[PDB]
Design a protein around this motif. Structure first.
Motif, PDB file in Angstrom:
ATOM      1  N   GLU A 158      59.363  73.791  71.602  1.00  0.00           N
ATOM      2  CA  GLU A 158      59.719  73.991  70.202  1.00  0.00           C
ATOM      3  C   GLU A 158      59.626  75.457  69.796  1.00  0.00           C
ATOM      4  O   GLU A 158      60.475  75.949  69.046  1.00  0.00           O
ATOM      5  CB  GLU A 158      58.825  73.132  69.307  1.00  0.00           C
ATOM      6  N   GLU A 159      58.607  76.169  70.277  1.00  0.00           N
ATOM      7  CA  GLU A 159      58.415  77.569  69.920  1.00  0.00           C
ATOM      8  C   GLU A 159      59.234  78.523  70.780  1.00  0.00           C
ATOM      9  O   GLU A 159      59.184  79.735  70.550  1.00  0.00           O
ATOM     10  CB  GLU A 159      56.932  77.938  70.014  1.00  0.00           C
ATOM     11  N   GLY A 160      59.981  78.011  71.755  1.00  0.00           N
ATOM     12  CA  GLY A 160      60.847  78.848  72.561  1.00  0.00           C
ATOM     13  C   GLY A 160      62.259  78.886  72.017  1.00  0.00           C
ATOM     14  O   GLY A 160      63.033  79.795  72.330  1.00  0.00           O
ATOM     15  N   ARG A 161      62.605  77.889  71.198  1.00  0.00           N
ATOM     16  CA  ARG A 161      63.918  77.877  70.562  1.00  0.00           C
ATOM     17  C   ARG A 161      64.048  79.005  69.547  1.00  0.00           C
ATOM     18  O   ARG A 161      65.103  79.642  69.451  1.00  0.00           O
ATOM     19  CB  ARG A 161      64.168  76.521  69.902  1.00  0.00           C
ATOM     20  N   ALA A 162      62.986  79.267  68.781  1.00  0.00           N
ATOM     21  CA  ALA A 162      62.978  80.419  67.889  1.00  0.00           C
ATOM     22  C   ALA A 162      62.969  81.734  68.656  1.00  0.00           C
ATOM     23  O   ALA A 162      63.265  82.783  68.073  1.00  0.00           O
ATOM     24  CB  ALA A 162      61.775  80.354  66.948  1.00  0.00           C
ATOM     25  N   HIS A 163      62.631  81.701  69.945  1.00  0.00           N
ATOM     26  CA  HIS A 163      62.666  82.875  70.802  1.00  0.00           C
ATOM     27  C   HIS A 163      63.849  82.870  71.760  1.00  0.00           C
ATOM     28  O   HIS A 163      63.954  83.773  72.597  1.00  0.00           O
ATOM     29  CB  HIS A 163      61.358  82.986  71.595  1.00  0.00           C
ATOM     30  N   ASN A 164      64.732  81.872  71.665  1.00  0.00           N
ATOM     31  CA  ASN A 164      65.935  81.771  72.496  1.00  0.00           C
ATOM     32  C   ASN A 164      65.602  81.715  73.985  1.00  0.00           C
ATOM     33  O   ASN A 164      66.423  82.092  74.827  1.00  0.00           O
ATOM     34  CB  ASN A 164      66.911  82.917  72.208  1.00  0.00           C
ATOM     35  N   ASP A 169      57.444  71.504  93.621  1.00  0.00           N
ATOM     36  CA  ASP A 169      58.414  72.341  92.929  1.00  0.00           C
ATOM     37  C   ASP A 169      58.017  72.455  91.464  1.00  0.00           C
ATOM     38  O   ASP A 169      57.977  71.448  90.749  1.00  0.00           O
ATOM     39  CB  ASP A 169      59.826  71.771  93.061  1.00  0.00           C
ATOM     40  N   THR A 170      57.723  73.680  91.021  1.00  0.00           N
ATOM     41  CA  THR A 170      57.454  73.918  89.608  1.00  0.00           C
ATOM     42  C   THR A 170      58.645  73.540  88.731  1.00  0.00           C
ATOM     43  O   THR A 170      58.486  73.389  87.516  1.00  0.00           O
ATOM     44  CB  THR A 170      57.068  75.382  89.389  1.00  0.00           C
ATOM     45  N   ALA A 171      59.827  73.364  89.330  1.00  0.00           N
ATOM     46  CA  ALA A 171      61.019  72.992  88.575  1.00  0.00           C
ATOM     47  C   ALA A 171      60.889  71.603  87.967  1.00  0.00           C
ATOM     48  O   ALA A 171      61.255  71.389  86.805  1.00  0.00           O
ATOM     49  CB  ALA A 171      62.241  73.048  89.488  1.00  0.00           C
ATOM     50  N   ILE A 172      60.377  70.648  88.739  1.00  0.00           N
ATOM     51  CA  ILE A 172      60.311  69.277  88.260  1.00  0.00           C
ATOM     52  C   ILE A 172      59.128  69.103  87.314  1.00  0.00           C
ATOM     53  O   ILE A 172      59.185  68.293  86.380  1.00  0.00           O
ATOM     54  CB  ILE A 172      60.260  68.342  89.477  1.00  0.00           C
ATOM     55  N   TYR A 173      58.064  69.885  87.509  1.00  0.00           N
ATOM     56  CA  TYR A 173      56.901  69.802  86.632  1.00  0.00           C
ATOM     57  C   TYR A 173      57.222  70.333  85.238  1.00  0.00           C
ATOM     58  O   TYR A 173      57.147  69.597  84.247  1.00  0.00           O
ATOM     59  CB  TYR A 173      55.730  70.568  87.247  1.00  0.00           C
ATOM     60  N   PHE A 174      57.589  71.612  85.141  1.00  0.00           N
ATOM     61  CA  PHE A 174      57.859  72.241  83.847  1.00  0.00           C
ATOM     62  C   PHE A 174      59.352  72.146  83.524  1.00  0.00           C
ATOM     63  O   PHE A 174      60.091  73.132  83.501  1.00  0.00           O
ATOM     64  CB  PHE A 174      57.375  73.686  83.846  1.00  0.00           C
ATOM     65  N   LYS A 196      67.143  68.698  80.640  1.00  0.00           N
ATOM     66  CA  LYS A 196      68.004  69.748  81.156  1.00  0.00           C
ATOM     67  C   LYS A 196      67.461  71.116  80.739  1.00  0.00           C
ATOM     68  O   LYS A 196      66.345  71.236  80.223  1.00  0.00           O
ATOM     69  CB  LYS A 196      69.439  69.535  80.671  1.00  0.00           C
ATOM     70  N   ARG A 197      68.259  72.162  80.970  1.00  0.00           N
ATOM     71  CA  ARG A 197      67.929  73.536  80.583  1.00  0.00           C
ATOM     72  C   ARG A 197      66.620  73.992  81.236  1.00  0.00           C
ATOM     73  O   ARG A 197      65.604  74.226  80.577  1.00  0.00           O
ATOM     74  CB  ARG A 197      67.866  73.674  79.057  1.00  0.00           C
ATOM     75  N   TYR A 198      66.676  74.093  82.564  1.00  0.00           N
ATOM     76  CA  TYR A 198      65.534  74.571  83.335  1.00  0.00           C
ATOM     77  C   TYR A 198      65.083  75.937  82.831  1.00  0.00           C
ATOM     78  O   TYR A 198      65.902  76.794  82.489  1.00  0.00           O
ATOM     79  CB  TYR A 198      65.892  74.648  84.820  1.00  0.00           C
ATOM     80  N   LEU A 199      63.769  76.136  82.787  1.00  0.00           N
ATOM     81  CA  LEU A 199      63.188  77.344  82.217  1.00  0.00           C
ATOM     82  C   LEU A 199      63.159  78.471  83.242  1.00  0.00           C
ATOM     83  O   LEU A 199      62.943  78.239  84.435  1.00  0.00           O
ATOM     84  CB  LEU A 199      61.773  77.066  81.709  1.00  0.00           C
ATOM     85  N   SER A 200      63.376  79.694  82.765  1.00  0.00           N
ATOM     86  CA  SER A 200      63.306  80.862  83.632  1.00  0.00           C
ATOM     87  C   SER A 200      61.876  81.092  84.108  1.00  0.00           C
ATOM     88  O   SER A 200      60.914  80.921  83.351  1.00  0.00           O
ATOM     89  CB  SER A 200      63.835  82.096  82.902  1.00  0.00           C
ATOM     90  N   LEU A 201      61.735  81.461  85.384  1.00  0.00           N
ATOM     91  CA  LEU A 201      60.409  81.747  85.922  1.00  0.00           C
ATOM     92  C   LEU A 201      59.819  83.006  85.297  1.00  0.00           C
ATOM     93  O   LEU A 201      58.605  83.086  85.077  1.00  0.00           O
ATOM     94  CB  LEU A 201      60.474  81.877  87.442  1.00  0.00           C
TER      95      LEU A 201
END
Length: 605
Positions: free
Chosen positions: A595-601, A530-535, A539-544
């Protein structure tokens, strides 16, 4: 103590292992089951089928057969193969939670349907919408119904078997005397014995006393109440058979149920029996026989009791005897919906408690209980369905014989779903059906990343919402109204996933743990990637769609979520994660997106 205690000092207080258990509606089941035998999710429309499924999983002769029918593709027989898919699922999880959602959907679908016991089926369509938990005689009615329907579907299997009839079938003569020196009889094979109508209990004086008188009466009795056209017929029922397994149904009066609770050792552990008269005679010891015949020994396999609460609620529990062959031993198991505790014989057989009522008892042949339980993998399973095209209506390549999956074959899976019924709580959220799944060739080669199934699953029940902004299921899921989709039943598409999990193949995808819960199948952990547990960063699972944009260079263009596109991008993401772990760059780039995704929401178009 805590919830797994199955005995309290007062005969009146119901132990915690028998009380109402919390709704599960990710729930953690580890403090409820220490043993290697699964429990069942209580989120079910039937308040009572779960106790019966457990009772049947632990008869070696019935378990081995219905699990056995999973060799061949038995699609027309839904209730029998869905019981097989459930039985096999319960066996291989070896303790992990199981859900009967697939089986329960077959039961509701079949129940929706010149013939006298059509009132049999109306009883459940009536009782699958609920106001108490369970009514009177309803467990017993399902016991007979389920056995009857399995035997009926068992006739239509591959290499048609009569195996369930040999164990359960009771040849019952019904002699109905109209006038003097003139009687008429019918003979039918009945799967279970019903201890229903009792006039005067001469069966409690010196024969209180144990259960065997009650079994004997229901095996040969004459009664003189009927009506014809103002006749009041006298009827004589008699069984001329002692079959391998004995399915008992108990429905007596509460006055007969409180008198029974004080005659200690009533429910008998083991007994022998044969037919000497045209009646069946069963005693405790074998020397209480006159010989006369082939002698049959019966041990108790298990039984289903009804618990009435201190808060006046009701539920069903299952007691079970399992034979381990390493030691000449019996492991007594008690089953509350997901509560499984190993108890001893003196507590399993006791009925001194007023909050306890036996409703379905099972007796097995002593020689046949020690028969080992056989998984379906001991046979050679028919895998044709992964290569053949089988659709039920009017972009991917099917597989070869050289593409035969083995233990460890890489495949990518994604599933789309629709919602039948929403929460409806006072109850719990119940319904959501499978719509479409896609598998992808995940093994590196000439045919890599190319799919090999794209199956929209037919469903006739009214769905509340298609969820197409999340699922992409165009309303062409109707049987003849395919948009252009290639449709297949649920039992065939489940067989495809079950066979892939059967061989030991490895699944890749995002949120696979969730999709498999709604496929109603349990894959072992080794076979999940599951790519879910890797990346994941806590919390706050990332959108595919985001990982497709920031981990490599794809704009997913998220319109209506394409099942097959998702399955493809998830495949190469697991390979990208694998490359990032081939050398020590895994945890480094793991925080580049953090860190660089927080500035991109966590979303960029």
């Amino acid at each position: 103590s805590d919830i797994q205690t199955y005995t309290s000092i007062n005969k009146y207080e119901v132990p915690p292992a028998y009380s109402r258990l919390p709704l599960t509606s990710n729930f953690d089941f580890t403090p409820f089951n220490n043993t290697e035998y699964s429990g069942l999710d209580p989120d079910v429309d039937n308040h009572y089928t779960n106790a019966i499924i457990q009772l049947y999983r632990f008869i070696p002769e019935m378990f081995n057969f219905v699990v056995g029918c999973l060799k061949d593709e038995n699609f027309e027989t839904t209730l029998l193969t869905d019981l097989g898919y459930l039985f096999d699922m319960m066996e291989r999880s070896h303790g992990k939670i199981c859900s009967s959602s697939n089986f329960q959907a077959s039961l509701k679908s079949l129940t929706d349907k010149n013939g006298e016991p059509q009132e049999h089926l109306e009883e459940y369509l009536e009782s699958l919408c609920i106001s108490e938990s369970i009514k009177r005689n309803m467990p017993q009615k399902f016991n007979r119904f389920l056995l009857s329907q399995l035997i009926k579907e068992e006739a239509q299997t591959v290499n048609h078997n009569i195996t369930l009839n040999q164990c359960f079938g009771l040849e019952t003569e019904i002699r109905t005397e109209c006038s003097c020196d003139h009687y008429d009889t019918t003979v039918k094979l009945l799967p279970s014995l019903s201890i229903s109508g009792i006039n005067k209990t001469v069966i409690k004086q010196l024969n209180g006393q144990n259960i065997l008188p009650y079994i004997e009466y229901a095996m040969k009795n004459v009664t003189q109440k009927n009506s014809i056209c103002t006749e009041t017929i006298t009827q004589e029922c008699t069984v001329k058979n002692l079959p391998s397994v004995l399915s008992l149904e108990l429905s007596l009066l509460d006055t007969e149920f409180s008198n029974i609770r004080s005659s200690k050792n009533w429910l008998t552990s083991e007994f022998y029996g044969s037919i000497i008269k045209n009646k069946a005679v069963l005693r405790s010891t074998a020397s209480e026989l006159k010989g006369t015949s082939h002698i049959f020994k019966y041990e108790l396999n298990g039984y289903v009791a009804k618990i009435t609460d201190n808060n006046n609620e009701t539920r069903l529990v299952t007691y079970v005897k399992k034979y381990n062959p390493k030691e000449n031993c019996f492991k007594w198991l008690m089953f509350n919906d997901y509560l499984v505790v190993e108890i001893t014989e003196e507590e399993a057989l006791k009925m001194t408690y007023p909050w306890k009522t036996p409703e379905i008892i099972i007796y097995c042949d002593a020689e046949e209980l020690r028969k080992p339980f056989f998984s379906v993998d001991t046979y050679s399973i028919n895998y044709d369905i992964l290569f053949r095209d089988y659709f039920a209506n009017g972009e991917y390549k099917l597989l070869t014989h050289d593409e035969a999956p083995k233990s460890g074959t890489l495949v990518a899976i994604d599933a789309a779903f629709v919602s039948l019924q929403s929460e409806l709580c006072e109850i719990r959220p119940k319904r959501t059906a499978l719509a479409r799944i896609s598998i992808i060739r995940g093994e590196e080669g000439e045919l890599y990343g190319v799919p090999f199934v794209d199956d929209y699953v037919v469903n006739t029940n009214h769905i509340e919402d298609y969820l197409t902004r999340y699922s992409g299921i165009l309303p062409g899921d109707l049987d003849p109204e395919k948009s252009t989709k290639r449709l297949v039943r649920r039992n065939v598409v489940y067989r495809k996933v079950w066979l892939l999990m059967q061989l030991g193949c490895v699944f890749v995808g995002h949120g696979l743990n969730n999709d498999f819960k709604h496929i109603n199948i349990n894959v072992p952990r080794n076979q999940i990637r599951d790519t879910a547990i890797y990346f994941l960063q806590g919390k706050r699972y990332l959108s595919l769609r985001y990982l497709a944009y920031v981990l490599l260079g794809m704009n997913i263009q998220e319109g209506n979520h394409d099942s097959i596109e998702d399955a493809h991008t998830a495949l190469i993401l697991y390979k990208k994660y694998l490359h990032l772990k081939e050398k020590a760059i895994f945890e480094k780039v793991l925080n580049s997106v953090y860190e660089e995704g927080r500035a991109h929401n966590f979303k960029v178009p």
